[PDB]
Amino acid sequence: KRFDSEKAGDREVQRTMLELLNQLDGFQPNTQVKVIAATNRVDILDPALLRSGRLDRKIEFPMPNEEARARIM
């Protein structure tokens, strides 16, 4: 996530993230490449990355139940 500060900050990674945001959707539409992303902690992620036009479908992986565990073993 981005933030506001005046004593010190962390801006370079934010600029690379802004360029990545601009690559998806943005001024120039792209329709030949597909993007897959993986993570395991969503609450610390920037809301602009979770826009519907930038990341369309969201899949959640639940913990396996009894039958799934038996199948895995």
């Binding site: 981005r2 004593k7 360029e19």
Partner: protein
């Protein structure tokens, strides 16, 4: 009868046909050999002239030379600051050249295959008028403001929640106006060299100054327009240097004429207090979330082209979709089409819309709902 020469005549005709290609080949060889007997010339900039036959010129790199000039060349065009070409073995003035145009600025000058018009954007018919009041009317009918006794503003910025239709509006304005236009992203003009970052922006303002009617648009201004740190780290004060260079270029010691700027960002908290001052960014434009009528308009815009069937009721869709965006409604249309894809159908029913609305609705639980306002 008289065909005693006919065979020899045909042989001569074939030989002439071959000689045509042999002469094309001879010409090609002549051009190839003629081209390879020339050398290049170094490029520099003149500073002043000491006497009738002596000038002092500076190359693109450091060293400065005291050089002569060609006899036939005119000496009335060599004012200080012009660009000249010098011989590589004697360093004599040979020719003067026009001003440079950077390849980056050339690429930035024209890149827009899109053809979006005003019919594809809906729900914000007032902010579009507010924006067009700045860049369209003063550039064509400028005696009205002089008659009243004011000066029209220069720039403006647009802000709001993500995905409310800012870049789309900018694309529509750029694609539906006959004037010189520049399009750039603020995060693509930075590089590790010492002076390039502040040089590129000076170059683009010079290019805009040359062709007097231009519009400059810079997306994601928060990349370089953030607040200036105290006790900050190295390799970060260069961005600040570029920032104050930009602040001086616009509303500085020299006035701009017939130049307008447009900026966009979806969180204006972090912007420098000096950049938001009136006189630099005169107008602040807000693009909020759509209303019920705006939602119905966007739905009618985007749900049109699909091969629908049966009866459709937009009222329930409008009531259910709360706090959505244009991207959310496009996603609703896409998800309805996907549910149509399953069960092997080739038409859409309102039940698909009802399912897709609630499918999209719960995905917004994990997305923050904060809203930011400039201050």
């Amino acid at each position: 009868k008289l065909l005693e020469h006919k065979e020899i005549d045909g042989r001569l005709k074939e030989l002439r046909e071959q000689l045509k290609e042999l002469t094309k080949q001879y010409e090609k060889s002549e051009n190839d050999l003629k081209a390879l007997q020339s050398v290049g010339q170094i490029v520099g900039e003149v500073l002043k002239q000491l006497t009738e036959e002596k000038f002092i010129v500076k190359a693109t790199n450091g060293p400065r030379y005291v050089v002569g000039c060609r006899r036939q060349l005119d000496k009335s065009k060599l004012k200080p600051g012009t660009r000249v070409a010098l011989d590589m073995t004697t360093l004599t003035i040979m020719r003067y050249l026009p001003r440079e145009v950077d390849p980056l600025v050339y690429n930035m000058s024209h890149e827009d295959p899109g053809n979006v018009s005003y019919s594809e954007i809906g729900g914000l018919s007032e902010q579009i008028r507010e924006l067009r009041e700045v860049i369209e009317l003063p550039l064509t009918n400028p005696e009205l403001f002089q008659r009243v006794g004011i000066i029209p503003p220069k720039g403006c910025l647009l802000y709001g929640p993500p995905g409310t239709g800012k870049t789309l509006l900018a694309r529509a304005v750029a694609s539906q106006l006959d004037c010189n236009f520049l399009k750039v992203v603020s995060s693509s003009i930075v590089d590790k060299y010492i002076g390039e970052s502040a040089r590129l922006i000076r170059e683009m303002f010079n290019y805009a100054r040359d062709h007097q009617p231009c519009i400059i648009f810079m997306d994601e201004i928060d990349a370089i327009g953030g607040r200036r740190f105290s006790e900050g780290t190295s390799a970060d004060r260069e961005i600040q240097r570029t920032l104050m260079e930009l602040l001086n270029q616009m509303d500085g010691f020299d006035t701009l004429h017939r130049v307008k700027m447009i900026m966009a960002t979806n969180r204006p908290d972090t912007l420098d207090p000096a950049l938001l001052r009136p006189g630099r960014l005169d107008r602040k434009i807000h693009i909020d979330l759509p209303n019920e009528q705006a939602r119905l308009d966007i739905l009618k815009i985007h749900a049109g082209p699909i091969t629908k069937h049966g009866e459709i009721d937009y009222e329930a869709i409008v009531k259910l979709s709360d706090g959505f965006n244009g991207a959310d409604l496009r996603n609703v249309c896409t998800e309805a089409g996907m549910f149509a894809i399953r069960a092997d159908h080739d038409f859409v029913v309102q039940e698909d819309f009802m399912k897709a609305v609630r499918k999209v609705a719960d995905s917004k639980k994990l997305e923050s709902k904060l809203d930011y306002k400039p201050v």
